[PDB]
Amino acid sequence: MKNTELEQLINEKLNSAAISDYAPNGLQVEGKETVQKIVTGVTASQALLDEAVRLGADAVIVHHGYFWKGESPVIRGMKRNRLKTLLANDINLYGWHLPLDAHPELGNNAQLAALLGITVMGEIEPLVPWGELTMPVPGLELASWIEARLGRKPLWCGDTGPEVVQRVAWCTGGGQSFIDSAARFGVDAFITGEVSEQTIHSAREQGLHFYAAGHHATERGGIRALSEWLNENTDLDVTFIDIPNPA
Amino acid sequence: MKNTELEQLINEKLNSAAISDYAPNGLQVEGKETVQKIVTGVTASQALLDEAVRLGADAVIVHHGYFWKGESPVIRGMKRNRLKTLLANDINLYGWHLPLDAHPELGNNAQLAALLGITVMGEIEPLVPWGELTMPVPGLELASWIEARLGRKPLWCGDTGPEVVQRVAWCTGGGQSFIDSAARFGVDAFITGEVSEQTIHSAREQGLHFYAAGHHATERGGIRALSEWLNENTDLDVTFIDIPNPA
Amino acid sequence: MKNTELEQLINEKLNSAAISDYAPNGLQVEGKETVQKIVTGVTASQALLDEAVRLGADAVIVHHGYFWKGESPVIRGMKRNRLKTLLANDINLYGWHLPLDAHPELGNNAQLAALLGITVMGEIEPLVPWGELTMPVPGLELASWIEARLGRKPLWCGDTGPEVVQRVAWCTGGGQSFIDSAARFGVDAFITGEVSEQTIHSAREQGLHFYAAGHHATERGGIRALSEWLNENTDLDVTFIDIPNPA
Amino acid sequence: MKNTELEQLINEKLNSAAISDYAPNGLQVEGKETVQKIVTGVTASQALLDEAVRLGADAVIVHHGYFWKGESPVIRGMKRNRLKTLLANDINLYGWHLPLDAHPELGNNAQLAALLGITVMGEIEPLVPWGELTMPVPGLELASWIEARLGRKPLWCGDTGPEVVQRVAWCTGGGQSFIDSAARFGVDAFITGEVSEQTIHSAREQGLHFYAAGHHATERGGIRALSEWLNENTDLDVTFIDIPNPA
Amino acid sequence: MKNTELEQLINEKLNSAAISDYAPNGLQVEGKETVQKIVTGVTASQALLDEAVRLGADAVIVHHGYFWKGESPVIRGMKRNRLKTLLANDINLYGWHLPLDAHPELGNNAQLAALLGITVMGEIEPLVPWGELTMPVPGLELASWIEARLGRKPLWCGDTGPEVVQRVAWCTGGGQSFIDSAARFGVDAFITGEVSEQTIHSAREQGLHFYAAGHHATERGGIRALSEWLNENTDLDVTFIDIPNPA
Amino acid sequence: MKNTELEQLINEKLNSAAISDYAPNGLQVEGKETVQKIVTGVTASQALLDEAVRLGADAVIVHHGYFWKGESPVIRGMKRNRLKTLLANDINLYGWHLPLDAHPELGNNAQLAALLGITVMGEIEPLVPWGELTMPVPGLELASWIEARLGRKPLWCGDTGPEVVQRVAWCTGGGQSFIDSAARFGVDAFITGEVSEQTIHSAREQGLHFYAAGHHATERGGIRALSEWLNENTDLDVTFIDIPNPA
Ligand SMILES: [Fe+3]
Ligand SMILES: [Fe+3]
Ligand SMILES: [Fe+3]
Ligand SMILES: [Fe+3]
Ligand SMILES: [Fe+3]
Ligand SMILES: [Fe+3]
Ligand SMILES: [Fe+3]
Ligand SMILES: [Fe+3]
Ligand SMILES: [Fe+3]
Ligand SMILES: [Fe+3]
Ligand SMILES: [Fe+3]
Ligand SMILES: [Fe+3]
C-alpha cells in the first residue's frame, strides 16, 4: 500500500482528524512510498526501531510517537538516534495518540474493558468510560484479577472502598487526574495506568478502590487491536511487538 | 506567635517570595491569630487534619496544601470536608511548595542527599542538584540502600547503567521529567519520586541507573527538617506526622 | 483375610506385576498372617504408623513405602523407628507405587481427573493422560478451582498460556519433568504435584498454564479410592488417614 | 578478551576441570571470538537470551546452560529458539554448574551463607557446608530473615525443630535430598532451594527446621559474585540480569 | 506417697481451695491408699484409663475429671465403664480444673505462653492473661507458628486484624467467650482452643486476629508441666500420656 | 405490610409463642412501620446490616439476633455500631431462634435432613430428630456427602462407628451436647454444627460416627426456607444473603 493511503485508511477508521491532541496523529516521519511489512508497538523506542530494521519493516506504528507539544525541536541524543535509524532506512513512522485511546472498538479504553471483563455502559467524560464488571468481586480479588489478565501486579489502594466492586470507571495510561471526576459520578472503583501522590488521597477520601495497573500494560490493547484489524482488512503483513516497560 | 508572624518567619527563611510557584506559598487558610501547637506533614489530607484536630493543633504546615493552579474553586466533596475541618476549628493551614524543595539546608532535595549519603556538588537546573555518593556502589546495591534508608522498595531500572554509580542527580517528588536534562549533564544515576512511561526509555537509551523512590517517601525530608528547625528556633510546639502514602 | 491373599487381591486389581517400578509393590514388611483392620495413607511415615498402632491396625497400605532403588539398606534413625514400630507390633506394610498412579479407575491420575472435573480422552505417555475440562475457564479461575477441590493453593505460572483452558494433561506427584512432552502433544495446561527451576521456563516458553498442585495433595486420590474399593469389595475394616504434608 | 581465553580464566578460578558434572562447564555454544560485553543470569532462558541480544552482549554466562545428561540431542521447540537466538547473533554461551556451587568464595553456597549471616565452619559433603548463624534465632524468625534477605517467602517446616536454630547446613538449588545427611551430621536447621514429598517426613522425624527458599532465589548469588569478580579483574563490561522465577 | 498426701501436695501447690469451679478439684475417685506410679492426661477418657491399667498405675491425674455441675449422677454407659475400670483396679483418679488453667508457673495459660514465645505482662481477667510476641509477625505466620508448635492447624480469622500482631491475650480450652473482653482491653490477637458462631463476628467487627488453636491441643501444657514438677519434687514415677483429640 | 403484622404472620407460622427461649423471638428492634423490602441471613452481623442498608431494606430477619440472656445490656462497641445502623436507618430487626430450629417444614433441623437426604422418623428429644439415610453408606462416604451438600469439609470422627451408617440423629448449630442422648437412643451417626473436647470421647466410647458440619453451614437452612416461604405467600420482596462464617 502507499504510505499515504495507510495514513488515510487508519485516520478514517479512528476518526482521527477530528480529535485535538498533544501530538500530530498519522505519518510522523516519512519513509519509502511503498509499505508492505509493518511493525507496531506501544512506543517508538530505540528498541522497537531496531527490531523494525532487523525484521525489514517498511513502516512502524505506535500509540506514542514524537513531536509532543512543548518539547525542544532540536535533534540530539535520543532523538538523533531514533530519527537516524528511521530516516537512514527509509522506514515510515506512524503514531496515533488520543484517537487510539478512544475508538469504541479498537481503542485502548475499549480493549481494557474487554480484557478485564467490564460491560461498557457509557462515558463520564471523553476519555473516561464507565461500566460494570460482569462478575463483581471484592477489592482484593479484583487486584489479583487485574494482575493476572495484565501480567503485572497493580498498586491497589482500597482501604475505604465498598465490599464488592461492581461499577467501575477507567482510563488507560496516565489517567489518574480523572479519579475525582469518576468519584463524583459514582463508581466503586477507578482503574488507570499510572499513579501520583494526590491520587491516593482521592481514593481514600472519596471511598473507592484505586488500581494503577501500568502505563505500558494498559496501552498494548489498542495498538495490538489496530494490528489485527490491519491484518484482517488489508494485505499488509503486520506484527505487534510487546517490549516490556514496568511503568 | 501570631499566625502572620509565623508566615513571615518561614517565608523569609525559605526565601519563598522570590520563587514562582504552581500554588500560593504561606498562610493558605487563616485561623486563630495565636499559634502555639503545630502539626506538620507532607500533605494536608483529611487524615492529617483529623490528627491536628485530635492533637488540638493551632496550625498545620505542609509541603502540599491547596489552591493549585487550574483546579476548580468550587468547594464540595473532599475540599468541603477539609476546609470545614480547618475553618470550623480555627486551624491555620500553611503550605510551602517549591521553596521547601529548593532550600539548600532544609529542602526536600538537600535532605534526601543527606539521607542517602550524597555530597552535593552543584546544580544542573533549579530543582535538580547533582553530586556524588561518598561511597560509590553498583546499581543493585544503590537500590537496596535507598530502600533501607527510605523504608520503601524503589523501582530501579539499570540494565544499561555504569557498573558502579558515583555521580548522581535527583529531584524529589514528580521530578521524572528531569531525567533527560540530567543525562545531558552526565550522571551515572538519577533519582526522583515518580515514574512515567517515557522515563524508562530515557534510562535505557542514555545509559543511566534510574530509581523512582516514591513521591511521598522522598518528600518527608523537608517538612520534617523545617519542623525541627521551628522547634529549635522558637517556643512553638511542632510535631511532624508521617501518614504513609505508597505513591 | 490372609496377608498374602490381600496382597494378591490388590496386585491383580491394579495389574501390578506387569509394571517395572522404583520399589517393590505389594507386601513390603510382613506382619501377622491374619488381616482384618487396615489403616491407609499416602506415605508410611512415623505419624501414620503411630496411628496404625493406636487404632490396632493389622496392616497399613500406602502409595509411598520403603526400599526405593538406591537408598542404603542399613537401618538407622527413621527407618529404625518406622521398621520397629511395624515389626514389634506385627503390622504388615504394603505399598503400591506406579500401579496406584495409573489404574484407569483407582489410580491417582484418574482420580485427580474426576476430582477436578476433567474428561479423560487419551494418554500422551504411560503416566501422562490428557483430556478436557468439562468447564473451560481462564487460568486464574482454574487456579482457584484446584485450590478449592484440593484444599491447597497451587503455584500457577500462566504468563503466556491461552485465555481459556480447555485441553489439559497432568501427572500426579513429582511429574514436573513431563511438561515438555505435554507441550509437544499440544495442551492448554499441565498439572502436577511438584515444581523445579526448569519447569517455569518450560511453561513460559511453550505457551501453557502450569500448576504445581502439591505432591501430597494430588496423591490422596488413589489410596483413598482403593480404601473405599476395599470396604465395598471385602469385609475388611479399612480406614484412610490424610496426614497433611505441604510439599 | 577472546572467548577461549575467558573460558580458561573462569575455568581456572573455579577449578572447574576437577569437578565431575551432569553437564559440560565452560563454553557451551561458540560465538564471535572477541568478547567485551557480557550478560549473566541464573539460567540461559529465552528471556535472558532476548535481554542479551537487546543489550548487544557478546557472551552470556549462566549457572544453568544446556546439554544435560540424558536430555535428547535433537534441536526442536525451545532448544531451536534458544540456539537460534544465540547462533544467529554470534553470542557465546558459557555455563558453570557444580563448580559455581562449590567455590569457597564466589559460589552459590558460600554466597548464601554470607547473605544469611552464617559463619561457615566446615563441610558435611561436597555441596553441603555447615556453620552457625552469628545471630541464633527461633525457627519462626529464621523464616522471616530468609524471606527479607532473599525477597521470597520460604516454605518452612519446623514442627519438631529445636527452640533456637544455631547450627545450620545448606545446599542451594535442588539439594533437598541432602537433608538426611545433614540430620546424621547433626544440625538445627537445613536450608535448600526446592522441596519434595519425602523432605518433609525427613524434617519432622529427625527434629529439625527445614526451609525451601527457592531454587532460583538461592542461586543468583554465585553467578552475581562471579560477574562482580570479572568486572574487578578484567576490563570486560559484565552485567547480571535477575529474571524472576518463583521455583 | 498416700493418696491424701498427693491430694494435699498439689492442692497447696496450685492454691486449689481458693478457686470455685464447675467440678470438684482433688481426689474424685478414691482408690489404693499407697500411690507410687502415676499416669496423667488431659482427660480421664476410657482410653487414658486403659493405659493406666496396662501400665499398672496407682493413680491418674487429669485436667478434666468427672462430676461436672448439672451432670446426671446415675452411672450407666460411659460412666459405668470408666468408674468400673477405676474402682475394680483400685486406681485413684484426681482432677484439677481451673486451678490447673491459672497457676502462674504450671497452668495451661502460662504454659501456652512459654510454648508460643509470648512474654506475659499481665492479666485482663482471671483466666485471661495478655502479653506480647517476642516475634511480632503477620496473622498468617502466627497461624503457622501455632500449627508447628501445637501440631495442629488452627482456625485463623483475621480479615480485619492489624498487619502485624504483637500484643495478644489468650485463654486455653473453651475460652472463646472472652474475645470481646480481650477486644475492649486492646490486643492485636486473641487465642483460645474452641470457637463458636458469634466468635467470628467478634473478631471481624473488633479488628483483631482470632485463633481457635484446639481444646485438647492447648490443654496438654498444664497437666504435662504438673507431671514434670511431680517427677522433680518427689519420688513418684509420673508419666504424661497425650491421647489425641482433634477438638 | 406493617412491621407488627409481619411479626405475627411469622410467629403464628412458627408457633413461636409456645417455645421457651434464650432470647426474645419476633420484632427485636423496631424501625419504620411499613415493610416491603426484606433482607435475611443467619446472623444480624454488622456485615448483614451494611448489606441491608446498601440494598435499601426495611427489615432484616435472622436466626441469631441480639439480647441473649446473661449478656450486658450496655450499648457499646459492636452493639452500638449494630444498633445505630438499624435505628439510624429505621430498619426493623426480627430474630427467630428455637422456633426456627424446630419447625417441621421450615426449621433448620428439617431442612438439613432434606438437604442431606435423611428420612425424618421421630424425635429423641425436642431439638433432636432422628431418621435414616435412604440407603446405608460407610462413614467416609457420608462425610463426603455432607461436604458436597453443604460446601464445607466436616470434622468426622469414626474410629469406633459401625461399618455402614443408616440411622442418624442430628441438631443443627451448637448441638454437640446432644450426642450422649442420641447414643442412648441408638443411632449409627450423630451430626451437629460444632464440636467440643468432650464430644470426641462420646463418639469413641459410644461407638458412633460423629460429624461436626459447621454452625453457620447447617443453619442457613431455616432462614433460607422462611425467606422463600415469605416470597411465596406474601408480596414482600425478600432476599436471603449467605455471608460465610467458617465456624
Ligand atoms: Fe500513554
Ligand atoms: Fe493513552
Ligand atoms: Fe511533591
Ligand atoms: Fe516537591
Ligand atoms: Fe509420589
Ligand atoms: Fe505417584
Ligand atoms: Fe540449580
Ligand atoms: Fe546448583
Ligand atoms: Fe478444658
Ligand atoms: Fe481449661
Ligand atoms: Fe445457632
Ligand atoms: Fe440454632
Swiss-Prot record, chains A, B, C, D, E, F:
A divalent metal cation 2 binds at H64, H215, E219. One of its GO terms (cellular component) is cytoplasm. InterPro entries: DUF34/NIF3, DUF34/NIF3_sf. A divalent metal cation 1 binds at H63, D101, E219. GO terms for biological process: DNA repair. Keywords: DNA damage, DNA repair, Metal-binding. GO terms for molecular function: metal ion binding. PANTHER family: GTP CYCLOHYDROLASE 1 TYPE 2 HOMOLOG, NGG1 INTERACTING FACTOR 3. NCBIfam families: PRK10799.1 (NF008064), YbgI_SA1388 (TIGR00486). Belongs to the GTP cyclohydrolase I type 2/NIF3 family. Toroid-shaped homohexamer. In the hexamer, 3 dimers assemble to form a ring-like structure surrounding a central hole. Provides significant protection from radiation damage and may be involved in the degradation of radiation-damaged nucleotides. This is GTP cyclohydrolase 1 type 2 homolog. It comes from Escherichia coli O157:H7. The gene is ybgI.
